[PDB]
Write a protein that binds this ligand. Sequence first.
Ligand SMILES: [Cl-]
Ligand SMILES: [Cl-]
Ligand SMILES: [Cl-]
Ligand SMILES: [Cl-]
Ligand SMILES: [Cl-]
Ligand SMILES: [Cl-]
Ligand SMILES: [Cl-]
Ligand SMILES: [Cl-]
Ligand SMILES: [Cl-]
Ligand SMILES: [Cl-]
Ligand SMILES: [Cl-]
Ligand SMILES: [Cl-]
Ligand SMILES: [Cl-]
Ligand SMILES: [Cl-]
Ligand SMILES: [Cl-]
Ligand SMILES: [Cl-]
Ligand SMILES: [Cl-]
Ligand SMILES: [Cl-]
Ligand SMILES: [Cl-]
Ligand SMILES: [Cl-]
Ligand SMILES: [Cl-]
Ligand SMILES: [Cl-]
Ligand SMILES: [Cl-]
Ligand SMILES: [Cl-]
Ligand SMILES: [Cl-]
Ligand SMILES: [Cl-]
Ligand SMILES: [Cl-]
Ligand SMILES: [Cl-]
Ligand SMILES: [Cl-]
Ligand SMILES: [Cl-]
Ligand SMILES: [Mg+2]
Ligand SMILES: [Mg+2]
Ligand SMILES: [Mg+2]
Ligand SMILES: [Mg+2]
Ligand SMILES: [Mg+2]
Ligand SMILES: [Mg+2]
Ligand SMILES: [Mg+2]
Ligand SMILES: [Mg+2]
Ligand SMILES: [Mg+2]
Ligand SMILES: [Mg+2]
Ligand SMILES: [Mg+2]
Ligand SMILES: [Mg+2]
Ligand SMILES: [Mg+2]
Ligand SMILES: [Mg+2]
Ligand SMILES: [Mg+2]
Ligand SMILES: [Mg+2]
Ligand SMILES: [Mg+2]
Ligand SMILES: [Mg+2]
Ligand SMILES: [Mg+2]
Ligand SMILES: [Mg+2]
Ligand SMILES: [Mg+2]
Ligand SMILES: [Mg+2]
Ligand SMILES: [Mg+2]
Ligand SMILES: [Mg+2]
Lengths: 174, 174, 174, 174
Amino acid sequence: VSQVRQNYHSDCEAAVNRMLNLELYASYTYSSMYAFFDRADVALHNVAEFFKEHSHEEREHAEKFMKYQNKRGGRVVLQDIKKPERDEWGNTLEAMQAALQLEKTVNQALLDLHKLATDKVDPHLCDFLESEYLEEQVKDIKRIGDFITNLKRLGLPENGMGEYLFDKHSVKES
Amino acid sequence: VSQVRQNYHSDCEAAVNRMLNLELYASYTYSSMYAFFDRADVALHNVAEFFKEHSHEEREHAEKFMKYQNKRGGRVVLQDIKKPERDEWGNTLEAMQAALQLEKTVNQALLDLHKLATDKVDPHLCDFLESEYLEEQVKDIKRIGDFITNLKRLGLPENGMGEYLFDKHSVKES
Amino acid sequence: VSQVRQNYHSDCEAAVNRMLNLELYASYTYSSMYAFFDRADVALHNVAEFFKEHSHEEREHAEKFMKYQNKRGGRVVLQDIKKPERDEWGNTLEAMQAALQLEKTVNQALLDLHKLATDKVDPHLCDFLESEYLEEQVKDIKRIGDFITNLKRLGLPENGMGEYLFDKHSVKES
Amino acid sequence: VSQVRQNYHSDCEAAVNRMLNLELYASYTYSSMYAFFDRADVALHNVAEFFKEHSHEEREHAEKFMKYQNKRGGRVVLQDIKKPERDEWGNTLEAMQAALQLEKTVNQALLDLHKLATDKVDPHLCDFLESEYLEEQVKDIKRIGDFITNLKRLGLPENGMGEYLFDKHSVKES
Ligand SMILES: [Cl-]
Ligand SMILES: [Cl-]
Ligand SMILES: [Cl-]
Ligand SMILES: [Cl-]
Ligand SMILES: [Cl-]
Ligand SMILES: [Cl-]
Ligand SMILES: [Cl-]
Ligand SMILES: [Cl-]
Ligand SMILES: [Cl-]
Ligand SMILES: [Cl-]
Ligand SMILES: [Cl-]
Ligand SMILES: [Cl-]
Ligand SMILES: [Cl-]
Ligand SMILES: [Cl-]
Ligand SMILES: [Cl-]
Ligand SMILES: [Cl-]
Ligand SMILES: [Cl-]
Ligand SMILES: [Cl-]
Ligand SMILES: [Cl-]
Ligand SMILES: [Cl-]
Ligand SMILES: [Cl-]
Ligand SMILES: [Cl-]
Ligand SMILES: [Cl-]
Ligand SMILES: [Cl-]
Ligand SMILES: [Cl-]
Ligand SMILES: [Cl-]
Ligand SMILES: [Cl-]
Ligand SMILES: [Cl-]
Ligand SMILES: [Cl-]
Ligand SMILES: [Cl-]
Ligand SMILES: [Mg+2]
Ligand SMILES: [Mg+2]
Ligand SMILES: [Mg+2]
Ligand SMILES: [Mg+2]
Ligand SMILES: [Mg+2]
Ligand SMILES: [Mg+2]
Ligand SMILES: [Mg+2]
Ligand SMILES: [Mg+2]
Ligand SMILES: [Mg+2]
Ligand SMILES: [Mg+2]
Ligand SMILES: [Mg+2]
Ligand SMILES: [Mg+2]
Ligand SMILES: [Mg+2]
Ligand SMILES: [Mg+2]
Ligand SMILES: [Mg+2]
Ligand SMILES: [Mg+2]
Ligand SMILES: [Mg+2]
Ligand SMILES: [Mg+2]
Ligand SMILES: [Mg+2]
Ligand SMILES: [Mg+2]
Ligand SMILES: [Mg+2]
Ligand SMILES: [Mg+2]
Ligand SMILES: [Mg+2]
Ligand SMILES: [Mg+2]
């Protein structure tokens, strides 16, 4: 084993690699959403930029898992980054609904990794998840839930004027 | 077709999507190299950071293709991002040799896209490649060639002291 | 011939004069749109100012063709600047639809001039078009396409409130 | 018992006193390493200063345990601080190998205290260890592992020039 490795279970090492892949997958989905809302036949640029920023955030969270893996003496093992489930994202409501489900999927994987770290008595990995991931996850889920409620209030999907207004007022001007 | 689309061939649209995928593939390879040199049993951190920066550069070049696709009225279509060819990168010389070959692969795909844009009489796409890609490519290839020459001069792969010195002197201090 | 003239075909010289006239024609159309939206019975002043700015841009692009003609040793030959096709422009959607078609007309003439410069092996004229015209054209077409999509979303032409909101939010406050 | 004491097990109190002693022991070992590398017949002053700084860090971590003990209502009980295992430290590689083993010894004691705090359902003590100790420990272990890899690369112990270069380049200039 590595000279630095201490109290780091093989199972946790492997689950960290799977988490790295899932963050890369999430980043790629958000990039797809960015590309969709940037289209001339969609043209909701503040929404597009929101998703672009979330793609960059998820990529940074993947990089943090890489750094973590190495700090603990495990080995970063990469797999293919699967393309997103959809090629087009319908409208702001459909996209935000998909984003919510993606954030919950990532959150469940984080919570599952915390259970594993707990089972293997790894308090460093527990701390890492609690301090760097779990609360920012709860915030992102809350924000997207807030958005979905407002998009429904604005009459999505039918109400184009409501969709226009969300883009001007609910997401930061880009 | 899109209302914005003008003088944009289907073939070019598709080749732009393939180029986007290749830039994402290149970014992912550089990330792998970063992760390798960051290891406690490799520990060449300036080299690692060089590759990290090149991964971020390639990702930005992918994003530029997405934006381009939309500007011309084509449709961004994503595919899986294949994992890198190797899981470990040997040493600085082997990595830089792989980097050189990757940059030449990307350059050939850019040159092939320029031939296609020329065949389809698309001067906007030609300009884009010439102004945003081809010269920065030539610079990156030259830099990596310079590095390889210096790594050989320093006695790689056998000469560890030479590898240590390259990391301190040839790549920017991180 | 002029002492400065080198590698400049008569055909290209003449096509540059026609391009100068077309830019002046485009500027004049945008001025008409400005005047329409400035009316007390139309009164969409941010839209008006958008068109005014685009009129000034096209006039500057005409001036650039004049300067070019002289730099290459050709002779600027002016013709009448035809009045715009319409005297009134209906509403923001109709105007933007007309603007899109005008920008595409100008783009096709630029692309036709690039084909001619290519046929006559004039790389300076090719560069000029690529560096000063073709990309800014693609950007203007994309912007107007984005606008049209949003105007449709806002319920134009029937939805006056949507037209009001476009003027406040989609074009820069004047 | 103390008026402030709540949910603080006797066992944890005692283990905190043992941890305080171990941090003082670690500080004293690093001081010995400092003194060795400061010698005129060793004379690697940047290495010496690295160990001096780590001695001061460990002493501060001991002081933090004292403060903790009092905050929780336990009683600081001091024991002798045993002299280091060696009186001379061979060379930079031997010293760093000893440092790695010391950091792992301290880390295991921290992890053992976390297990005890977990057994006695003391989340405050768990937090304290996670927030103030465990991650900085992982960082120090990683740094020393990185160093050992570079010292081997530089040809230690035989290669004096490599040892000289490590002192100039790998540790901060003092
Ligand atoms: Cl290992
Ligand atoms: Cl282990
Ligand atoms: Cl294990
Ligand atoms: Cl990526
Ligand atoms: Cl789809
Ligand atoms: Cl967090
Ligand atoms: Cl909200
Ligand atoms: Cl509604
Ligand atoms: Cl199309
Ligand atoms: Cl077309
Ligand atoms: Cl086609
Ligand atoms: Cl491999
Ligand atoms: Cl370039
Ligand atoms: Cl060089
Ligand atoms: Cl050699
Ligand atoms: Cl002449
Ligand atoms: Cl001539
Ligand atoms: Cl001629
Ligand atoms: Cl005029
Ligand atoms: Cl009319
Ligand atoms: Cl341009
Ligand atoms: Cl827009
Ligand atoms: Cl409506
Ligand atoms: Cl007490
Ligand atoms: Cl108690
Ligand atoms: Cl007790
Ligand atoms: Cl001794
Ligand atoms: Cl810590
Ligand atoms: Cl290092
Ligand atoms: Cl040696
Ligand atoms: Mg394993
Ligand atoms: Mg598939
Ligand atoms: Mg927190
Ligand atoms: Mg977040
Ligand atoms: Mg997150
Ligand atoms: Mg409003
Ligand atoms: Mg097609
Ligand atoms: Mg495969
Ligand atoms: Mg050319
Ligand atoms: Mg250039
Ligand atoms: Mg470059
Ligand atoms: Mg490149
Ligand atoms: Mg003539
Ligand atoms: Mg007439
Ligand atoms: Mg040609
Ligand atoms: Mg340009
Ligand atoms: Mg323009
Ligand atoms: Mg133009
Ligand atoms: Mg007691
Ligand atoms: Mg004794
Ligand atoms: Mg915590
Ligand atoms: Mg912390
Ligand atoms: Mg520390
Ligand atoms: Mg410590």
